[PDB]
Amino acid sequence: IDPPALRAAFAGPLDPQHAEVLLSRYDQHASRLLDALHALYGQRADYASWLAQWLGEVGDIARQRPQALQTLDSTRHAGWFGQPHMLGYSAYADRFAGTLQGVAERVPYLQELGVRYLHLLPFLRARAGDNDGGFAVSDYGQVEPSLGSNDDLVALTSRLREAGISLCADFVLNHTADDHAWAQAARAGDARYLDYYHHFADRTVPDRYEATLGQVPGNFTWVDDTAQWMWTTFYPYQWDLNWSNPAVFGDMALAMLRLANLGVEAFRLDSTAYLWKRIGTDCMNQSEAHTLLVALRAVTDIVAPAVVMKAQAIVPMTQLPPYFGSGVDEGHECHLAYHSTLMAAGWSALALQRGDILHNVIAHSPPLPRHCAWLSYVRCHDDIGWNVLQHEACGNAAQPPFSLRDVARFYANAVPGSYARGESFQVHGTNGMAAALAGIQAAQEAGDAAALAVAVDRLVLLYAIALAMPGVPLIYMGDELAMVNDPGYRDDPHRQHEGRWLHRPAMDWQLAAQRHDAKSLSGTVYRRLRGLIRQRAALGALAADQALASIALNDPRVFALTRGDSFIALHNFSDQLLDVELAAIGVDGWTLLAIRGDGSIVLPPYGVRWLQ
Ligand SMILES: OC[C@H]1O[C@H](O)[C@H](O)[C@@H](O)[C@@H]1O
């Protein structure tokens, strides 16, 4: 409890030329950091010494932050990630361009699309053999050799930065691969690193925990080398870190800052809802898990304020707001959170031709805290998790119930008339590319030009929705070219049995070349999306600090989304021509060229109209 001594510990390693700005930020945020750490570790006898030692290390890393990034830290404004020009892209570096140097040479492509936020999937050193597509991390401080070197990472972020692109990287902080140095040291008998994990000799403690835990068989894995049961929420080769140990917090905070110093500007906080373990509970979305994130945010506010934290928490709407900070800490936790509820409702709506479901989600979308926004999306590297919509599926006063079962069966083409070509993964989730799910694949396979045109309208409709949202709209690699499924995985050696590869294709650069050709399918999709991106960028009304709402319409097939007080986006989720009367939405304005009026607004099947 000696603030000046802690401040001195942090200040020591800083250089005089760059100590004032840093110390100024420490002075305004350090208290929140110390309060969070006290709540978590304050009772431990080793707390004070650990704290002063770690702060010194933090100071040393702060000092090492390249000048260009320190400059960014000082010039970037809070809320920068929510400006209308922000557009995201998510891809595997290997699938995209093979290696990190390859990705850097494709930046022009990302620049032309209008990308300003690039999420590269797990590219840090991963477990030998199976590693869940990189999510079993074995070194948080080093790039996977098959992808390149840390030098290539620095050259990539420097290049990205020039093009106005912020690299988002996964920070898998809940668990590490079981061949991570810490885990190997544990396996070797080091009690210091064994304690970086949750380990038990008998199933005595594990069963008590098992009493209230939900399983993502069981939550523990026997390990001969440590001769103990290790907590393994996900794959058996992924050991849950012990965040109740101050050392784990310290070292993980340092790893995060080292990544920030390599150019990482955004952190996708993986499985962040499982961070805190307490018997008698489901060990999910725990109070302390949020305190951990508040502490990591305070660390970034001090050392690398240009960076943002994004929660990866695929949970129902009601459990997302706390990720932006609750009560006293609102605005002091994560900057972004995935709006998975919206993503699943978009597809549910499309399959059911029901815009009322989207009115329901937006109408109930909790208002964003200042300087916080949503990561809106259509697809990603995982299966579509329909269960986050359990609550909305029950219906309410305005929206009758809908069937998650039927929605999943429709996209799995397990029902007669479906234009979808996804596959059930495990209500089981759905695998498949956006174009495969919206009808593009089926139409191409039937060589049915009319159906193709309509399928194209459906894909665009879903993306138009994400693009009108407050935050970062994230395009999943290849959707901009309407790439379809990749059944090749069923032929690949050690990849069959992992159905998600169906929607993890290697980037098709020939298709990409066709983007110029407006008569081609890829070129048609690319142009429609670019048009929305272009219009979005010019609408200050779409900035994340402007309101988001939805006007209740009595025609269930329509969805009216509003931003601020000047923008309205109209959507027809059915295959019928219909119209919306100006009365119902109180308008008479300009029709945006996503491509005026005092007459009703006619919407073609699956059409979208942006009005100012
Ligand atoms: O635990 C492993 C899982 O972590 C996250 O949920 C990733 O999004 C998913 O792709 C991965 O399989």
With a 6 Å cutoff on the Cβ, whether 381 touches ligand 1 is: yes
CATH 1.10.1740.10 matches 1-85: yes
With a 6 Å cutoff on the Cβ, whether 498 touches ligand 1 is: no
Helix axes 287-303, 20-41, angle to 10 degrees: 170
**For residues 315, 316, 320 and 322, what is the CA-based torsion angle, rounded to 10 degrees?**
-100
First to last CA, the chain: 56
Residue among 231, 234, 239, 240 to mutate when testing ligand 1 (max atoms within 8 A of CB): 234
- Superfamily of domain 547-612 in the CATH hierarchy: Golgi alpha-mannosidase II (2.60.40.1180)
Query: Can you tell me whether residue 231 is helix, strand or coil?
Result: strand
Long-range pairs for 227-231: beta carbons < 8 A, 24 or more residues apart = 227/201, 228/194, 228/199, 228/200, 228/201, 229/199, 229/200, 229/201, 229/202, 229/203, 230/178, 230/197, 230/198, 230/199, 231/197, 231/198, 231/199, 231/277
With a 6 Å cutoff on the Cβ, whether 117 touches ligand 1 is: no
Considering only CA atoms, which residue is closest to atom 2 of ligand 1? 135
Return residue ranges of the chain for CATH 3.20.20.80: 86-174+243-546
CATH 3.90.400.10 matches 175-242: yes
Task: Find the angle CA(432)-CA(438)-CA(444) to the nearest 5 degrees.
Answer: 90
CATH number of 86-174+243-546: 3.20.20.80
With a 6 Å cutoff on the Cβ, whether 338 touches ligand 1 is: no
| Experimental determination technique | X-ray
Return residue ranges of the chain for CATH 3.90.400.10: 175-242
User: Could you tell me the CA-to-CA distances from 181 to 1, 139, 187, 225, 446 in Å, in that order?
Assistant: 33, 7, 10, 14, 52
Q: Which atom of ligand 1 is nearest to the CA of 175?
A: 1
Contact assessment for residue 536 and residue 612, using Cβ atoms and an 8 Å cutoff: no
Partners of 240 in the β-ladder? 175
Q: Which residues contact 517 (CB under 8 A, 6 or more apart)?
A: 523
Considering only CA atoms, which residue is closest to atom 10 of ligand 1? 382
CA atoms in the 13 A half-sphere facing the CB of 83: 14
DSSP string, 29-84: HHHHHHHHHHHHHTTSTTHHHHHHHHHHHHHHHHHHS-HHHHHHHHHPPTTGGGST
With a 6 Å cutoff on the Cβ, whether 135 touches ligand 1 is: yes
Contact assessment for residue 539 and residue 468, using Cβ atoms and an 8 Å cutoff: no
d(CA 376, CA 359): 16
Return residue ranges of the chain for CATH 1.10.1740.10: 1-85
Contact assessment for residue 449 and residue 403, using Cβ atoms and an 8 Å cutoff: no
Contact assessment for residue 421 and residue 443, using Cβ atoms and an 8 Å cutoff: no
- Phi/psi for 288 (5° steps) reads -60, -30
Question: Per the structure block, which two tokens stand in for 530?
Answer: 């670019």
d(CA 170, CA 366): 25
Q: In 563-575, which positions are buried (b, 16+ CB within 10 angstroms) versus exposed (e)?
A: bbeebbbbbbbbe
Considering only CA atoms, which residue is closest to atom 6 of ligand 1? 271
Return residue ranges of the chain for CATH 2.60.40.1180: 547-612
With a 6 Å cutoff on the Cβ, whether 132 touches ligand 1 is: yes
Q: What is the resolution of this structure in A?
A: 2.0
Considering only CA atoms, which residue is closest to atom 3 of ligand 1? 135
Q: Which residues contact 154 (CB under 8 A, 6 or more apart)?
A: 262, 263
Residue among 127, 173, 241, 271 to mutate when testing ligand 1 (max atoms within 8 A of CB): 271
**Per-residue three-class SS string for 63-78:** HHCCHHHHHHHHHCCC
Contact assessment for residue 473 and residue 467, using Cβ atoms and an 8 Å cutoff: yes
Question: Per the structure block, which two tokens stand in for 358?
Answer: 């989207």
